From a paper:
Thermococcus kodakarensis, a hyperthermophilic archaeon, harbors a novel enzyme (PPMTk) that exhibits high homology with phosphohexomutases but has no significant phosphohexomutase activity. Instead, PPMTk catalyzes the interconversion of ribose 1-phosphate and ribose 5-phosphate. It contains the active site motif, “TXSHNP” (serine as the active site residue), and “DXDXDR” (the metal-binding site) conserved in various phosphohexomutases. Thermostability analysis has revealed that PPMTk is highly stable at higher temperatures with a half-life of 90 min at 100 °C.
To understand this unique property, we crystallized PPMTk and determined the three-dimensional structure by X-ray diffraction at a resolution of 2.39 Å. Crystals of PPMTk were grown in 7 days as needles (0.1 mm long) in a monoclinic space group P21 with four protomers in the asymmetric unit. The structure was found to be a homotetramer. The crystal structure of PPMTk contains two monomer–monomer, and one dimer–dimer interfaces stabilized by H-bonds and salt bridges. The protomer was composed of two main domains, the N-terminal domain consisting of residues 1-350 and the C-terminal domain formed by residues 355-450. The two domains were linked via a short linker (loop 26) forming a deep cleft. Domains I, II, and III consist of a three-layer α/β/α sandwich each, while domain IV has a two-layer α/β sandwich topology. The N-terminal domain of PPMTk was characterized by low-to-moderate B-factors resulting from stabilizing interactions between domains from different protomers within the tetramer. C-terminal domains, however, were not significantly stabilized by interactions with other domains. As a consequence, their B-factors were high and their coordinates were less well-defined.
Author numbering:
A (entry chain D): 3 to 449
B (entry chain B), C (entry chain A): 3 to 447
D (entry chain C): 3 to 448
Write the structure that this text describes.
Amino acid sequence: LFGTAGIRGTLWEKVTPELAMKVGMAVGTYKSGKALVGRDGRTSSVMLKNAMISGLLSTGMEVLDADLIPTPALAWGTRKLADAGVMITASHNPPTDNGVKVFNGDGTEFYVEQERGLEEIIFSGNFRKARWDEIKPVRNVEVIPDYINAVLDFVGHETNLKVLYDGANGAGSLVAPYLLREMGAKVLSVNAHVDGHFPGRKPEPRYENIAYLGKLVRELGVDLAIAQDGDADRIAVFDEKGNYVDEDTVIALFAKLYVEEHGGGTVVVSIDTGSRIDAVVERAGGRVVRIPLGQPHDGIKRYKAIFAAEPWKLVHPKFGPWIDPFVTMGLLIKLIDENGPLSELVKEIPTYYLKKANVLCPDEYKAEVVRRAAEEVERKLSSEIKEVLTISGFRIALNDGSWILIRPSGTEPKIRVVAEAPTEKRRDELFEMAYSTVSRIVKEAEK
Amino acid sequence: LFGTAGIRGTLWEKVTPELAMKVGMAVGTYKSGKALVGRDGRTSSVMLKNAMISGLLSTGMEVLDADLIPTPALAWGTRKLADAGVMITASHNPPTDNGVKVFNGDGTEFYVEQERGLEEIIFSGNFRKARWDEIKPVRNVEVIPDYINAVLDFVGHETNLKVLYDGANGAGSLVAPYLLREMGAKVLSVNAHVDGHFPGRKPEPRYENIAYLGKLVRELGVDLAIAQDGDADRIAVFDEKGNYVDEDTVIALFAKLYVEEHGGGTVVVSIDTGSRIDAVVERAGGRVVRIPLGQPHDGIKRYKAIFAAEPWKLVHPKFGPWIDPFVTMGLLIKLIDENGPLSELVKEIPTYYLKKANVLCPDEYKAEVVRRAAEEVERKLSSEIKEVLTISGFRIALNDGSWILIRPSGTEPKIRVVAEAPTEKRRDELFEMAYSTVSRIVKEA
Amino acid sequence: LFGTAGIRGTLWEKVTPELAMKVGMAVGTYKSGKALVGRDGRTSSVMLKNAMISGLLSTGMEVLDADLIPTPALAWGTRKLADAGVMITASHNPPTDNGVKVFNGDGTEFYVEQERGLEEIIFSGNFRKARWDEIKPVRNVEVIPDYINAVLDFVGHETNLKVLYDGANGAGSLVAPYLLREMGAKVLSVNAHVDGHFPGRKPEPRYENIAYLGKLVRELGVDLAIAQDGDADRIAVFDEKGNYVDEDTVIALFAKLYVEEHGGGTVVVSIDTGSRIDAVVERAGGRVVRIPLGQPHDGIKRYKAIFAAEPWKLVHPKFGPWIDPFVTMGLLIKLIDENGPLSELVKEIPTYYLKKANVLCPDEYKAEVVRRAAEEVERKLSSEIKEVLTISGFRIALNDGSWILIRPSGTEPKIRVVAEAPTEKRRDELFEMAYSTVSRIVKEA
Amino acid sequence: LFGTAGIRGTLWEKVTPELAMKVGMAVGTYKSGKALVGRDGRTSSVMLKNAMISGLLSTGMEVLDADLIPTPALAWGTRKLADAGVMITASHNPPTDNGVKVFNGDGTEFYVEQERGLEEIIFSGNFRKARWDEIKPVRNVEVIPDYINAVLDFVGHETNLKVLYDGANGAGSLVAPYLLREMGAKVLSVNAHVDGHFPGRKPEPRYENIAYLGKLVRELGVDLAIAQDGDADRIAVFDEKGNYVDEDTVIALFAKLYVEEHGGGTVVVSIDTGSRIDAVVERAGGRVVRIPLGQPHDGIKRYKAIFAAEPWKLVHPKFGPWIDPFVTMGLLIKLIDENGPLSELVKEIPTYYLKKANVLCPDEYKAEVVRRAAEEVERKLSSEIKEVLTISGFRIALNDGSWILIRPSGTEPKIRVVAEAPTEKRRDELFEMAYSTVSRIVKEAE
């Protein structure tokens, strides 16, 4: 059931009312006391929330119903109010899809160990049943105003910046515009009316889904563009010139800020974030530990990290251990007002050049093909190896700051192939090697 | 799954979230358009309503959420607003129980065809599945105030009577006090805070549960007492003396007034309602048909009748097809204001005397036992037999207005034994005979 | 505008939407930050709450709207949530009336200088005005469940008692029956549906408005009857024998309880409470001080008291400064469960005999009549005299524990007369002296 | 208290909680039965709505609380649900201001006679007071989804057009995006999160507040842009090329559509809508009658009109006697899908050239300066006069389709001066004559 980022899938195939009721029933067998429930704007979300609540109620848990809320606010509100938290969302997936994310009473997403717990209870049907006289009444709660205040107290900044905010027709529309305006920003919102058909654009704030914003920034005269996904756990940014600031740069900006403050410390990033981060962290005298994509919070506990991130998701541990783009965009505005325009701050981040691509493989082979292709690429680059990470596929780092990721995704039946180098010519050289080496090996096992 | 009146049963045994959702899914596979959804105050109802609503939504039906409402208001609202109605309730059962009642867009409970249809669909697992872009938002609706206005306009009576209302800690507490006050009634309410532990009393307004009201009537100086079940589709009444006005006298009163205004016409009642009703209806020039316990309005269509009833449950078809105790309490008060105290109006209703007991019998041998027992009673009394009905067990009617009913039960494993006579002796004789005939057959096989 | 415990009067006469708006304006000129807003169930209370809320918002205060909650829950919620509280209510006044009560961030009612401060601002019309961009959104808050949990945690007692709860169709109906149920009590409720017409009875839980409850306690076999007013700040109790436990007996029971645990300590009662409190407190080695009818907490601050009370209104300082009958309720159940049936417990209380009546008197002839009709009775009986109190009219205490009270009413044009003595004779002779001493000096002018 | 379109003003100066409570007390003295109450997103709207409901309750009226709703949804819901309608809004004014609009049970705005009735009642203090036992409980109602269903039913059109919707941070944002999506439109919204600070732009959809939209239309490849005000009773449009379609062109598309349908009929437009209406109405065999600003509904009963409009505000009598930009945007999409791109459709509208400015005049003179100036411009144009309307200021129509408006606004120390002509030279020449004539006569009385 759980992938890397919760339970996610297409309606009727994987995600059903029946399952959502099973997950509530399992959350109230594994955990007890109070459950904070929230949902995103998808057409199926109220249907799945009513199932979830039916499930949670059946176990004797007191349900606190927050209804339509961004995921971060559900994580924050869970810490403040509840013993467990449940979010109805498929985040960045199309409107055919929904899912469930589960949170603990400290605001952290479920650990791998806790997910397997919940699945064992679902597979067994061994659910805690309340007596009739232990079934607690639902309590409606209003979290967004408290969340917005907690984010303004944390950020401690006033602005006059003009800001373009793109809400993907999602839960961020009920929080980001108001937060920015409270800070004294002049907000021009796009896709900031909540709509589960995602009429504005595909909700995932990939560059190709939000490219129009770069043009909007120049015409409008804004200091900064901010885009989100449907449950607003992601953040994407454009500068005052309408340049897309890519995800590694956004992370590098904060990785530098955090390490320089502390005069050092551990930063934790995903296996698939690049050398912009190692570059600015080492120069300022801290270190980088890489972990699998999915659990940026996990790294904080293990490595005592001051900052953790994956592409589009930063964690601000002094605020709390959830991905918090509301903190992120608040602090990005403080960075600009305190140091000058965003395009000049991105110049102080070194250029690397990434090139990724999927290369299709059956799920039966997947793992064999990666293991055999990592060995071959290592051998061909043996003169240049700095380190091989094995924690999530194979990340091969080279002496000059280049690296290759060869990794199977947990879901789709294919292999992820990333290469990054300090030059375009070498981005191309290494990507070709990695791509074609995987391509050729795939078609071997396929005959 | 469906008995006489909805799906009922105990939490976790037969009634679950899983089933509540499958029923929603079934209703939205069998019908389309709008579902009006309501619940009573049991501790499990919001949980089941959540599951139900998930069900309904998954089929592309547009849910209207009326939340905590009495069943008659759900029936009325279903006719105003929706193509189907669903009610989370077990009406008069203990706090441990809940269930679902399903209504059509004209306000009638499911007919047997439609119950079976729904049962097949659940068994099949073949539920209609909306596409993501056909799942409809929930609409919250406030029914009670419009329901109250509709009763008030139908009854068209102001009053100054003092009324004692017992809402059985249930859904009636949100409606009857306010309808009585709007009519002019001075209401003293008991058990009129909503609570699914039913702390005040067992919710079923059987005399044995509501008999304290008798003495309360005396002290408080009230004209009338009204008592209800947890979803408020039952009504029981006490008079100004504090005397219980049993369920046939109540039906008799309504039978009498309906057959008079008309100048005759048909009155459908249950197979277990006795001769108080036959007496007033023939005297005022009308006829009585009988059906099985379940939906009095089945009768109305079938026997073009002007009134129908079972014990506690009266239908006023000029208003609508559903059991409507809110109409009943409004017309009882109108009756009294126009004609004089209730105790006076009940003297003008012939006495008969009823004794009833249940004899346990396995759900398996029920048809078998009755069969023999009834033909034995037919033989032992053959000189007197005026009529035998086989529609629900056997109702053996004698020449001297007496009768014996020997009926198999539905949701319990017992046979139901009843006698009505015009004397305490002729009663005691026909019952302590009829009971021991069934009793002795059950002690063989 | 303010009397002893709030602004109150007749709709359209003294209390208007206009006044309700000016008070909101005045509160948010005198204070800043957050205002918690609550109301009782009177017909006019939503109209005045809207006017009140418009007032507060206009000053830049952040309004927290609790809607329909009892006064104690508003005072409790104010301490938890806000810088000021506002209650729309006239507590025990008839349905023709409403009012406002203003609370501080610690949950105390308006102190006199706040009252005067507020009145000058209203007369002046110089109200703080928010700029457009400082008017704050209303926040809806659910207080009752949290207030219920706070009271349970403080009473620390589960029971199995049967209890008769009479909510005067008022705000207590949404709270008492559920607090009693979560403890384990089997609640039988009367007048426990909210109704601003107060159909059940006069909302003031005077013996003669709630008399009927006595013969009802016997009938149902309850261990205790509890009655409140419409805002539920008041409590009145009958025992399992259906004997009215008069209001000093209740006070004395808690007096005894609070002083015995402590080993002495001081007890603030109002000037018109009797010798029952004097006796159980001295006996237990504690000290009794009298203050005027108003706010019993003024006593806790001044005299570091462990317990304050007036007739029908107890304060439990360990919980909070407000009159809290939800705490009284629960500690009284815990008393009975720990020391036996209530009728027994009221026997361990000394008996005195009380009589009172009102003499109509113009406002300008109150200051005059009393002082000069008290000079007189002070001289006649200056043999016995143990102490005269003049802090609130004249209260003449004798050496045999007897006493007389002549007092000018706050909010009505009449002189109040009270006599109490250890004996049936000594009582009836004092009341008849003092009552006709006034009546006579009235017809001088 | 009432100006053109309801009671409007700056917070604390004219518009107060105490005023809003008086207006409620007045409406429940002038009218009986049920009152539907709505508001816009202004920071003061909840404060004034609470005061309004307090007033209305005090008179025994049954209050139906629709909360935050656009004005057109309030007029339609009033017709469905109630005997009176109240809207808390200052519509297009800055966030410093608020206001009250009142509506009859048939969904018409209050007539001048009805406004005086209310003002007298407010000025006398003689409000109907309910007895305690007649104060009715407030009923919360959900109008928007019923309203969207009625507009979709009335429009009878499915689409796949791309559409830029600009909600000006206002009540339109809760209806227009959903009504467009349900028609099949691919909606990209700007300023479609409600906020009383109007952070996106000034909510009045004059061209100069919404100029940026024309630029976004091109970049984004949209077929149509639609911009509204704060209460969404106004509509403004840009075509697929980012061309601002001016308010007379929008009215004219619809005058022509309505007059071609009926082969004739009367169209009622305000005194300051110009000649492109006359061109398409006469060419299809209909006639144009003019009335003053603010009363476009008054045309329907008075002149039996099939369509009525003033700049930004169109009435579709067959749906209701209120300004309904939701019906408008729906019918524009239907127009475009059935006839071709918007830019092509506006080419079939004859070109006139307008030029407007104000001239400062003390309130004490105003009337005198306009009367004298109009007599003087008439005489100078005497060889050319088609018609001179006096119903609101002086509108001087010439034989060639040109015209001059000289009008004192009934709320400000200035005189409004319009001139339109088939040609640029004639525009300039006629505007030069009228502007300078008025400008001179002002300073003599000084």
